[PDB]
Curated annotation (Swiss-Prot), chains A, B, C, D, E, F:
Official protein name in the record: 3,2-trans-enoyl-CoA isomerase
Key word Amino-acid biosynthesis present: no
Annotated localization: Peroxisome
Family stated for the protein in its record: Belongs to the enoyl-CoA hydratase/isomerase family.
Sorted UniProt keywords: Fatty acid metabolism, Isomerase, Lipid metabolism, Peroxisome
Lineage of the organism: Eukaryota, Fungi, Dikarya, Ascomycota, Saccharomycotina
Designated gene of the protein: ECI1
Record-listed substrate binding positions: S61, G62, A63, D64, F65, L104
Organism of provenance: Saccharomyces cerevisiae (strain ATCC 204508 / S288c)
GO molecular function, one term: delta(3)-delta(2)-enoyl-CoA isomerase activity
GO terms for biological process, alphabetical: fatty acid beta-oxidation
Length: 248, 248, 248, 248, 248, 248
């Protein structure tokens, strides 16, 4: 994979989206590859934190679109697989949001444990109602969990973004670094610099043990949502609305 | 019914409380009639949104009070029936709060998916402790859900209002229109004007499909709360405190 | 017990931590004694509210540390017993936070129904990662419940405090009294003065009936967390990290 | 109460239905009194077993029937109260079935932990379909639990008895004493004689501790069934079929 | 449809498999049609019982088998749809087993409320292990429910039939009519004759109300099993074993 | 380990208790070793079935008994560990019961998927009430599951065996081989001979996939029971009754 790299640095397994010209739009194979990277981090006994970083002005613009058209099975299969990988990951997942995230990639940002923002222009957009689709990526559970049920209905029902002010009002962002959007590279490195200082002295297996207990609060709900989001969308695909709108 | 009207406008089924002289206080039969209206909206395949609007300076002052006194069975039966109608409604429920809401009618505002406020003087009051009663209308679940558990205890235990500032601090209000309280009529129409613009372009069945999945997060808890609130209150009624206080 | 007193005043059972020179650090026996006091309040049919108050500049600095070293069984047994007492208490629990609370005593502050703060310097610290331990005191559930899941991960994973600003942003504090930290005594009395005015007129059994229904939302999760936090920590103790760090 | 006596004998609290001329038919007040007896046994720290015994040829023929007709509230309230008493009882409940049991009293036989039969003519009958009613006494859960789901549908749907052969095929009866039906008195005493021999040597608190864990398998289902059976029947009563049939 | 007829007779909606030459083997469209018939019975306010009857010596031999081979999606979609129809049916489902039932059709026999057998040669066979498949039709839940967990493992793991003796030992069969296998027609009519006599006198809405409460014991488990059986099989199909074995 | 051997034969991982002179009584270390063997079988991708076989006239007489007396922690820790290993095992567990099994080893027989008996003299005994203890090994759930709730109370409350006739009446035994008790060796080999014939032709991964779905019916209940049995017993140990009785 050329759009995504990774490396390990002490207890940190770092994943980097490096396709800024295309606003880190991702195809099915990029979402599989992201899931396999989380599997590799999850099985590395030296890794304690899995940091997701991107590049350019967008974190990611979401799915990249270019009866063989039954090609929606590999689409649906790639969404489930990468969602399930984020849900079950046992290492502390940290998103460095260097700009907006849209669709599935915004769904994965909502599954990370901790989120840092480059500046106040970040936003998350879930345009399901505009694509003739329904919740995906576990957002049925993660959005009301992290932004509250009334705010989630306003955004999802009317295809409106979860903006910075909403994200701060809910504690979704742990720290805003207030850096220009023209340098994700420097924001990425300053998050890693603060992280290296904050882990000093700590017993790192305690982070994983607390995460394991923390995750048991909503883990069944998340696995259930992953399966019913997919079950429920099938008729939307059979009707064909998404296909038309996806041709746009 | 003379206190409540309704009409349909494209995908919007609009319900209007139109008894401003009495601060849209409602009797048992008005709460049944409200439940039947939601049933009619729920079965209309053209309706996607059910908008609740009122009139005057109050959204509603709550229940209107004027062994045949075993008249508390029709009271308890009307609360359950209208709560159950809000809980199971499948269309997007939107409250236009044109002023304060008290009691059962404040419980129903907390069951809507989205809430807009006329101005910063709105408040929700649940004076159960002052009437010798306990939670009703599903507020056992909806209040800690939408306002947080510590804030819910402060308000409920001490008969204190959930005011505007608390509502905004929790994202309970999606938009404050900042209009005078002397014209609910203009606020009602401006909410409908914004709604007509926000649905343009959207695939409306996607709104209902996301709501169906969203509602499965807490639907069992809500149905359970509706039944145990009623079970639990019966001894309060047998003791007779509410009867005395309701005579006041 | 010399470090903790109690008294009853109308419907209020008042518990007072009175060891300000040692920052109300508590040993195992002080945590048992606190649990027994809650049992006494819980069985007193005249008590409706259980108020916890402290003294000095700290609410409490947490556990006081001075194969008989299998002394961690009485440690683990005292944490479970006092957590279980806070979880199942049927009277309205109110914490008067006169300064910071750390560890188990910060876990118990998060189990109270209502919390008042002396001033904006209060904070809650859970330094599990720094002691080679994991969540305790039901904080697996109470922290994400009251502060949100992303904020809880930032604080717990990196041994960072839940400060005043975070507490207000989540409605954790019902009222800040903005008094100097040199007089907890006057803050304690002004909370009791406001409480005596707010209960006037109310039907006090309604407070307990609403609390009983309110508590059934998360009571199983809390009991489960109390048991799995303890189950899960045992290997941390068998490995011996906490023992070393506790020697510091 | 003249129809029911009780006594304590070592670890055994013995309850005896002593109205053989009327086939131990019970009224609402007899079912309350039975519930209060179980409360007395449950709070006696010397009792470990609660033995229910009757007299004559029937264990019990069920409910004794002789807008004040809203007399069905005390009916429904007495069924719930005595069912809830059997469900939550913490001592080992043992039924000595000296003949057939019908209706609510057959529902209570199905809530005992252990059942002995006088001879092969015993049967349990639940004639809900013949009275225009639905399951009661927790039989929604206890019948499929103890007799299997297909057999429960045959009996309940067609108002057919659960006979001895069905009871033995499911292990419902621990021992048949094969005594004439003209002497319940001797069967009652021989059950007590065997019981006194079987408890010898045993650690009696172990019986209660195993029962507490055993009961947590279905206790929520039983409490839920008690509440929804009652909720669901209300419309049957509002329609008036049972009233007519109960006049027969 | 030529392989399946139906008719209504008082409160009985009768469905009849009438393809004895082919041992009432069914294709996908026959399983859809069976589901639609149950929908028609379920919405008929005069029907209280839905009786399933067949013809000839077999009740049914199961699925009839004669990248377009992605034809397994319509296969999987037809199994889910007809299972879901049996699970949610609100009328009393009664199977008249006139001979053996194999596969999906044996799964549907295990979802009926009541089962009558023509004679002791009936058996149910679930040859999942022999087709490279896993449980289907809700048999993950219905088999351990109705035959016990150890017996279910013996049969399923080793592709062995649930025979008559096993069915009687578990109360799966309510009545064996002991008629020759050369006349299903007479057995069908004698079941209907007994049914007409057993409903006399009964309040038929009481049958449906008891079924509604009875079904809430395992309805979530059944819906869950229907969805995870399908989710889990997909990799068996991707591997291709079933395809090979289905070519046999 | 000298008391237990194992070997692999095609898809069968065979475990053999080979201490007939001591009636295959087991110590803590033998129960750990049994758990580790199940781990080895569980991770072997060639094994599909885990067969447990013993020797002599008893399958096993249970635990072998010969403040350091706080030796009950290693006792309790060994019971949990080996129970958890049986609960989570993913391969088909088959017990060859060559005679009676008592205590923990009888608890493990009740956790196997399939059980074969040498002859009609086998029995299972759980003498918790006679040792001043409570349910262990997951028997809180497995006994009512496999023998029914009333029969379980008779046996457990009165320290009476689950005998062959009770085992057959519940389908607990899939096949009785009716061989003398003086040759377990020949019974062991004839079970393996039948097993080798029954797996022929089958798709072996289908056995594991059906087991995975089958086990999700009660797996949470089993894990919960393992943890609360242990939590609940601790006070029995603190009181000291078991210690006294274990000295006997």
């Amino acid at each position: 994979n050329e759009k995504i790299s990774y490396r390990i640095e002490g207890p940190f397994f770092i994943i980097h989206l490096i396709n800024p010209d295309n606003l880190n739009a991702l195809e099915g194979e990029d979402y599989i590859y992201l899931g396999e990277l989380l599997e590799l981090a999850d099985r590395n006994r030296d890794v304690y934190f899995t940091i997701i970083q991107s590049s350019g002005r967008f974190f990611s613009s979401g799915a990249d679109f270019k009866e063989t058209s039954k090609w929606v099975s590999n689409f649906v299969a790639r969404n489930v697989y990468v969602t399930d990988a984020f849900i079950k990951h046992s290492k502390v997942l940290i998103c460095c949001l260097n700009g907006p995230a849209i669709g599935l990639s915004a769904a994965l940002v909502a599954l990370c444990d901790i989120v840092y923002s480059i500046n106040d222009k970040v936003y998350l957009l879930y345009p399901f109602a505009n694509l003739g689709l329904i919740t995906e990526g576990g957002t049925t559970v993660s959005l009301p969990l992290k932004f509250g049920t009334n705010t989630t209905y306003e955004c999802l029902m009317f295809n409106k973004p979860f903006k910075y002010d909403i994200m701060c009002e809910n504690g979704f962002i742990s720290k805003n670094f207030n850096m220009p959007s023209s340098n994700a590279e420097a924001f990425n490195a300053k998050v890693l610099e603060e992280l290296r200082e904050k882990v000093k002295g700590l017993y790192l297996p305690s982070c994983l043990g607390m995460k394991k207990l923390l995750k048991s609060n909503h883990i069944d709900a998340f696995n259930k949502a992953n399966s019913v989001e997919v079950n429920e969308s099938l008729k939307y695909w059979v009707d064909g609305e998404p296909l038309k709108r996806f041709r746009q």
